[PDB]
mmCIF file of C-alpha atoms and ligand atoms in Angstrom:
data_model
loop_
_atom_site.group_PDB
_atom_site.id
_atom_site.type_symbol
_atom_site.label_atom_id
_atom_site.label_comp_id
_atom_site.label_asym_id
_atom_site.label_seq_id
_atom_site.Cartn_x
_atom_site.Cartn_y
_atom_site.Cartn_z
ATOM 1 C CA UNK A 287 27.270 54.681 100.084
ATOM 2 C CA UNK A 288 31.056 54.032 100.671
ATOM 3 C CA UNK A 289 29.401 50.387 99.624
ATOM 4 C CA UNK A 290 28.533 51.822 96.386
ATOM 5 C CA UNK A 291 32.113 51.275 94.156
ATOM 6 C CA UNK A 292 31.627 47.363 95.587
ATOM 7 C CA UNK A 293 28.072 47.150 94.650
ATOM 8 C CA UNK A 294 29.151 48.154 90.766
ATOM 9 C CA UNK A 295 32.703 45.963 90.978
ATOM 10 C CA UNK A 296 29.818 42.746 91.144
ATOM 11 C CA UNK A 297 27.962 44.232 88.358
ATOM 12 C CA UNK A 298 31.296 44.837 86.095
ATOM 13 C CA UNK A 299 32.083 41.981 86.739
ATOM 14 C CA UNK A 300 28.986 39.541 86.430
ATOM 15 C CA UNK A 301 27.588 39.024 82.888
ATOM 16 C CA UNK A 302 23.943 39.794 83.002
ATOM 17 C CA UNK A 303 23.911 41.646 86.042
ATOM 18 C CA UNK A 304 20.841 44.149 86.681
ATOM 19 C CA UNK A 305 21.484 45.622 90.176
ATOM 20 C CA UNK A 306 23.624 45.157 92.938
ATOM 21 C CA UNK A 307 22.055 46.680 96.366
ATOM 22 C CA UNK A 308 22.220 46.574 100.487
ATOM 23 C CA UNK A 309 19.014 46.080 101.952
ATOM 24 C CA UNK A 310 17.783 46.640 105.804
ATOM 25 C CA UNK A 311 15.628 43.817 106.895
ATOM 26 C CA UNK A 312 13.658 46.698 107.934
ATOM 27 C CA UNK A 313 12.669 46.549 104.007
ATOM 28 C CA UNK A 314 14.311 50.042 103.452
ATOM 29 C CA UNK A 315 17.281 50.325 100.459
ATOM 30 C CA UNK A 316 20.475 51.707 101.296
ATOM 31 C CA UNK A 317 22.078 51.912 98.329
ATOM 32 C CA UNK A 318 22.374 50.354 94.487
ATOM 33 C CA UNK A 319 24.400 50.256 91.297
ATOM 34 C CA UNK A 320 22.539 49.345 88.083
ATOM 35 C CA UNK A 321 23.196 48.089 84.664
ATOM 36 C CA UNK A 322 22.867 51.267 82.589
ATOM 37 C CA UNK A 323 24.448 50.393 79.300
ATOM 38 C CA UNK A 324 21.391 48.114 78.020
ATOM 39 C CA UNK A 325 22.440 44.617 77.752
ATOM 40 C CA UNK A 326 21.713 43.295 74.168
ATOM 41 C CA UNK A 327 18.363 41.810 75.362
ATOM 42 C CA UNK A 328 15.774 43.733 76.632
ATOM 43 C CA UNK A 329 15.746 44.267 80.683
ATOM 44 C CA UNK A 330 12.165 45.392 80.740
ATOM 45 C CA UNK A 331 10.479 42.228 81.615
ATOM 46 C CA UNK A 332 13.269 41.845 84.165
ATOM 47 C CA UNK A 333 12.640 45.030 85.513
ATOM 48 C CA UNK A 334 9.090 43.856 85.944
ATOM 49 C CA UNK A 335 10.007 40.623 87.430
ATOM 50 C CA UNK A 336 13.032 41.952 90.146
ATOM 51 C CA UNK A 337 10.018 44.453 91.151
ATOM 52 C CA UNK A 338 7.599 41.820 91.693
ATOM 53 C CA UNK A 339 10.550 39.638 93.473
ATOM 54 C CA UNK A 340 11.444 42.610 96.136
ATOM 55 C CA UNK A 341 8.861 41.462 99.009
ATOM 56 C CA UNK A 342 9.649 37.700 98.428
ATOM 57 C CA UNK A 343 13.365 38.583 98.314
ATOM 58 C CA UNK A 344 13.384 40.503 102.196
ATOM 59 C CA UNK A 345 11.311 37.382 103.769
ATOM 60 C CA UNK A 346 13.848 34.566 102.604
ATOM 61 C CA UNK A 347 16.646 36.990 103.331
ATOM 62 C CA UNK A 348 15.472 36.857 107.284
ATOM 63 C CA UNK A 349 17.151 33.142 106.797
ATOM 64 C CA UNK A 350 20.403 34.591 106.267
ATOM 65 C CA UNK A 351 20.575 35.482 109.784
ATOM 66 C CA UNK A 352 20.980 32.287 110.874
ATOM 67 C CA UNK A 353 24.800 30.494 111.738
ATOM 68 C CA UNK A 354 23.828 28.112 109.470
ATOM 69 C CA UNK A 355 22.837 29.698 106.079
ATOM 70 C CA UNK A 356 25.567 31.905 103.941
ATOM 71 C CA UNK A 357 23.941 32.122 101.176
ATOM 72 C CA UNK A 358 20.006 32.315 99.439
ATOM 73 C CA UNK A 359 18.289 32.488 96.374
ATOM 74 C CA UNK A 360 14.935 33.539 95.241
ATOM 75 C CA UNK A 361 14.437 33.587 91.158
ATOM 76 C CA UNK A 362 11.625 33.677 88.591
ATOM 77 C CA UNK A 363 11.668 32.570 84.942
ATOM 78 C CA UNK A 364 13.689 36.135 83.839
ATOM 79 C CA UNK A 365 15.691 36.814 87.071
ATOM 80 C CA UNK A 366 17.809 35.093 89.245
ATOM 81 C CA UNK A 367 18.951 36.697 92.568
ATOM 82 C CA UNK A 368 21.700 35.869 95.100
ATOM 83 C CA UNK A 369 21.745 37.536 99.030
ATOM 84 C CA UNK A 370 24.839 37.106 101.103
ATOM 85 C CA UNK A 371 24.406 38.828 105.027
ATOM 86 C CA UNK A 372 26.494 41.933 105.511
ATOM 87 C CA UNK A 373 25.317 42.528 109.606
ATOM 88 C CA UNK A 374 22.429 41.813 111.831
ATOM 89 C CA UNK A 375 20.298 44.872 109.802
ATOM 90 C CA UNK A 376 21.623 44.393 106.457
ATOM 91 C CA UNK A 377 22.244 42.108 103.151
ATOM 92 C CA UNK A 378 23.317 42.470 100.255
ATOM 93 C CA UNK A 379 21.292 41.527 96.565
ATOM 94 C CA UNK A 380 22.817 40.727 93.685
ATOM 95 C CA UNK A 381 19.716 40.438 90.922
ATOM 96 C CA UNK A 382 20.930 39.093 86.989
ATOM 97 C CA UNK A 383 18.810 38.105 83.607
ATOM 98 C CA UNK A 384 17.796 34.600 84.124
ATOM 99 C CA UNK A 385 20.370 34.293 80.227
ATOM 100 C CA UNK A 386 23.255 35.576 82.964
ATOM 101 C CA UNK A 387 26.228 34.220 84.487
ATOM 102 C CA UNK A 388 24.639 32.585 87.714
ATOM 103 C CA UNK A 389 27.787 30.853 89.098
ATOM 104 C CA UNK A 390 30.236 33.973 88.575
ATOM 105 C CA UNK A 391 27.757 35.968 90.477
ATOM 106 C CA UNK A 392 27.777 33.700 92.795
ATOM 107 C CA UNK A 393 31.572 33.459 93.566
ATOM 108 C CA UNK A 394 32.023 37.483 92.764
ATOM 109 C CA UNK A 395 29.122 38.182 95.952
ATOM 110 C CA UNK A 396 31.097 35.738 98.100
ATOM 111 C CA UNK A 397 34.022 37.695 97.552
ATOM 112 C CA UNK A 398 32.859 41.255 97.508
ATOM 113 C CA UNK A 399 30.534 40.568 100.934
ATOM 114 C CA UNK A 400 33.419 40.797 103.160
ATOM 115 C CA UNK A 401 34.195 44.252 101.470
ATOM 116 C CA UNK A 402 31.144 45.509 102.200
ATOM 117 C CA UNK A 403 31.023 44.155 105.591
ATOM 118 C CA UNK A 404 34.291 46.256 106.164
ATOM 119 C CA UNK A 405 32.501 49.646 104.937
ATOM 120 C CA UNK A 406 30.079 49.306 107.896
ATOM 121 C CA UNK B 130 5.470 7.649 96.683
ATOM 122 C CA UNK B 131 4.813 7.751 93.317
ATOM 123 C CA UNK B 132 7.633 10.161 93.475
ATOM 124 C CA UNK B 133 10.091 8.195 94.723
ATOM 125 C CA UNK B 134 10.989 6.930 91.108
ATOM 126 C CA UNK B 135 11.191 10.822 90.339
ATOM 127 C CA UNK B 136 13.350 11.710 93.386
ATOM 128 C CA UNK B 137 15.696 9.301 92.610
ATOM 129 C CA UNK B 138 16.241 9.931 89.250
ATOM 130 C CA UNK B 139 17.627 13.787 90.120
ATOM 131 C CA UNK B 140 20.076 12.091 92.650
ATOM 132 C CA UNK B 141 21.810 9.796 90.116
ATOM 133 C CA UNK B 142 21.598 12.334 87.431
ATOM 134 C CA UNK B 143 23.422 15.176 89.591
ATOM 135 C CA UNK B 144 27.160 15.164 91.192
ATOM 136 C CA UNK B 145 27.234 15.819 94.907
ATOM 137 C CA UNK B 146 23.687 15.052 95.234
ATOM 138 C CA UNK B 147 22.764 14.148 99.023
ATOM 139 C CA UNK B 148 18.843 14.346 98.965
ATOM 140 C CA UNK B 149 15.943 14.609 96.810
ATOM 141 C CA UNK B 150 12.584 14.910 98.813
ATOM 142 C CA UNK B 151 8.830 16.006 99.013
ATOM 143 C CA UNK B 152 8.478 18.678 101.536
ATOM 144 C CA UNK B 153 4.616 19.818 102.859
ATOM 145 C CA UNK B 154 4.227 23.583 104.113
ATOM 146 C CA UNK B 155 2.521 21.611 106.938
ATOM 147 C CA UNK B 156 6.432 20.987 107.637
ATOM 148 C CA UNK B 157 5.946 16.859 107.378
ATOM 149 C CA UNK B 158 8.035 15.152 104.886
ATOM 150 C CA UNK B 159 6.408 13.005 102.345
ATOM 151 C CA UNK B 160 8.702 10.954 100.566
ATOM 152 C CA UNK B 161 12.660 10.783 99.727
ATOM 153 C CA UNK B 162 15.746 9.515 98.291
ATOM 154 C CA UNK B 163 19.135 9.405 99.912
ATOM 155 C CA UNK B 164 22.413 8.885 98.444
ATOM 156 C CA UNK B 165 23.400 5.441 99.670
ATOM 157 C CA UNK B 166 26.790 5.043 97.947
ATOM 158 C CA UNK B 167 29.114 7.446 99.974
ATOM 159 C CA UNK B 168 30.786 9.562 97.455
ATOM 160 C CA UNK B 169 34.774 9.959 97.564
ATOM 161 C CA UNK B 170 34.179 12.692 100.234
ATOM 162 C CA UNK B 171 33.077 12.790 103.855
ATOM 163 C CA UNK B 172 28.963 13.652 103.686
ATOM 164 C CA UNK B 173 29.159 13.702 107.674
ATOM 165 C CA UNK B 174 29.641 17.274 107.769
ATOM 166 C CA UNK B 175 27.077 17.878 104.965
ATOM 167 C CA UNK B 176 24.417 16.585 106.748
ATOM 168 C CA UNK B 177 24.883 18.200 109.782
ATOM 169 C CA UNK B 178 24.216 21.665 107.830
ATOM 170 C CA UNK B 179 21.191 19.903 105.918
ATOM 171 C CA UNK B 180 19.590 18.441 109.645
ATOM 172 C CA UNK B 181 20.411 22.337 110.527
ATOM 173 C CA UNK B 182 18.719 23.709 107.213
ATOM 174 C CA UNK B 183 15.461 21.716 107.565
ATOM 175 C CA UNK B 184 13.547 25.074 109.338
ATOM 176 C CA UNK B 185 15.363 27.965 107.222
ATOM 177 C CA UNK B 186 14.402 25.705 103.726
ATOM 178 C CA UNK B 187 10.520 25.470 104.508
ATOM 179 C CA UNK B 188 10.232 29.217 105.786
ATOM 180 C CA UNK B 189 12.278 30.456 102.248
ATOM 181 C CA UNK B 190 9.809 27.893 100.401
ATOM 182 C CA UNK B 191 6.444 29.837 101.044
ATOM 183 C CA UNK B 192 7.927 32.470 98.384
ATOM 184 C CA UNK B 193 7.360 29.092 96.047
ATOM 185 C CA UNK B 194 3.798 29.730 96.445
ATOM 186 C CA UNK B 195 3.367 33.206 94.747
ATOM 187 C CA UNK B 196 3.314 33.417 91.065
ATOM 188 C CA UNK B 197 6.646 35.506 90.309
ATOM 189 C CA UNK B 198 8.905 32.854 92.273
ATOM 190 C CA UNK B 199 9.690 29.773 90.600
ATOM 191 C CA UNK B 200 13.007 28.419 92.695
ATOM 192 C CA UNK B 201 14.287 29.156 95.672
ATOM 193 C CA UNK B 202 17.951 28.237 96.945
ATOM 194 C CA UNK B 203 18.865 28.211 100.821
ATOM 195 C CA UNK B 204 23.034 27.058 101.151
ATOM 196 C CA UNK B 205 25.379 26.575 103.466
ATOM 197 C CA UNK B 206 29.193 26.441 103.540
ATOM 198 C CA UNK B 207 28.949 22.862 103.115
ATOM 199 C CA UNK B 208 25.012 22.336 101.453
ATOM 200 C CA UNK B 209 23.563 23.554 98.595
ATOM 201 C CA UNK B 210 19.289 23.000 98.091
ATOM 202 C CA UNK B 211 17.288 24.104 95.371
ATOM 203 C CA UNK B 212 13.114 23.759 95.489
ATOM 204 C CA UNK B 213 10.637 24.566 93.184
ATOM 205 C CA UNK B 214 6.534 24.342 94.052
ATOM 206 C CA UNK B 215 4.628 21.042 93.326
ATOM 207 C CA UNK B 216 1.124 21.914 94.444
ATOM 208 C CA UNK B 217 -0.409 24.610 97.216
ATOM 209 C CA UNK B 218 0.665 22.327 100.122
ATOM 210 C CA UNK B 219 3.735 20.262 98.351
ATOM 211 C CA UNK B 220 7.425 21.881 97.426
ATOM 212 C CA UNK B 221 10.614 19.627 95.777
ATOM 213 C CA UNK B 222 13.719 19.498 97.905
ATOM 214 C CA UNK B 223 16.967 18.729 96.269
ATOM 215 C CA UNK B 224 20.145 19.180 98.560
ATOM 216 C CA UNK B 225 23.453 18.499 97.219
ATOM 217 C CA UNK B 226 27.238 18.922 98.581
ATOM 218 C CA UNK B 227 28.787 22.306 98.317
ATOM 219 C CA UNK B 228 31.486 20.644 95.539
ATOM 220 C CA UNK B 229 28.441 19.163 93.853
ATOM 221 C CA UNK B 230 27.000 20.406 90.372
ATOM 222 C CA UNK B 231 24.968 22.629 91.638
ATOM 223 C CA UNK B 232 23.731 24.048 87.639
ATOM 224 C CA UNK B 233 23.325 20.675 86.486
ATOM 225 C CA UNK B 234 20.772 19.900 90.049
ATOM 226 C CA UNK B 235 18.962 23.391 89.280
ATOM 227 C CA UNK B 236 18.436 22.026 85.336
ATOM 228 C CA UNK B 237 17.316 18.196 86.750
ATOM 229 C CA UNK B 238 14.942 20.030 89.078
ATOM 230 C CA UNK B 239 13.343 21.955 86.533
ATOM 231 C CA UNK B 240 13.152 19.300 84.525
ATOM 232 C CA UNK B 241 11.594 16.590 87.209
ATOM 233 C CA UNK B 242 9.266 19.403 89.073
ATOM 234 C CA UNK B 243 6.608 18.487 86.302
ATOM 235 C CA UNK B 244 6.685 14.931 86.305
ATOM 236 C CA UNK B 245 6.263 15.303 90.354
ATOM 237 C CA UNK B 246 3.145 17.465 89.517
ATOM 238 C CA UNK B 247 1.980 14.774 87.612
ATOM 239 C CA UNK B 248 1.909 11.897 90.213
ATOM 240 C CA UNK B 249 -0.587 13.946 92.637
HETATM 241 NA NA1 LIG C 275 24.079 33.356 108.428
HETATM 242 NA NA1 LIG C 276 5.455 30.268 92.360
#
């Protein structure tokens, strides 16, 4: 968790953001930062949604370990996630309201990846 | 290809727009439309990273098929793709140029998805 003042610059930063987190593709968490301070809308059925997302999220994630692909996204109607890889046993998931700012999430995980990448 | 009308709609509508295309989980394309008219940049690059996508997209795409996940994005430095599910064995393939539009080819998607789902 020296990632874990990186994982809540993205979520400063990004308008809409729920969670910032490194995953293992061994489908463990490593660490998080989440939205406290409730957004005007109401998270819940996000919440519901990012939980139901989590398996989906690890398989397409497994993609990211190619030379090829940088960058993936798996969303539902509420919640919109971006993964960027951080090594061969780890990524990082950046998971906003589907109302958020998709594009400056976008850019702020390409920037804070190598950051994290460092911490390892 | 019915669709083709469809297909090429989303590639005139959307900046930076390489490929539109039907896509089976079987792994056989079914139908497509290709930019023609080179854009002011070089696409060479570009689709080397799409030829090079073409295994990562379809294994991210089987998230398509549960009901949570509604689009799924798989990008390169160079390519951006967005798909959404047409039917249990079908899945809409848009691919676009990393300098492309890439929230205005997510909306056109969206939008076109239906009227895809409405030629089978
Ligand atoms: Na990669
Ligand atoms: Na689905």
């Amino acid at each position: 968790m020296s990632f874990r003042t990186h994982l809540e610059s993205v979520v400063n930063q990004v308008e809409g953001a729920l969670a910032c987190s490194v995953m293992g593709f061994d489908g463990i968490s490593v660490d998080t930062f989440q939205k406290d301070e409730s957004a005007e809308l109401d998270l819940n059925g996000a919440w519901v949604e990012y939980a139901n997302l989590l398996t989906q999220l690890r398989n397409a994630a497994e993609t990211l370990k190619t030379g090829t692909v940088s960058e993936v996204s798996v969303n539902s109607e509420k919640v919109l996630t971006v993964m960027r890889l951080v090594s061969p046993d780890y990524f990082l998931v950046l998971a906003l309201h589907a109302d958020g700012n998709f594009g400056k999430g976008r850019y702020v995980l390409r920037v804070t990846a190598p950051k994290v990448r460092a911490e390892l």
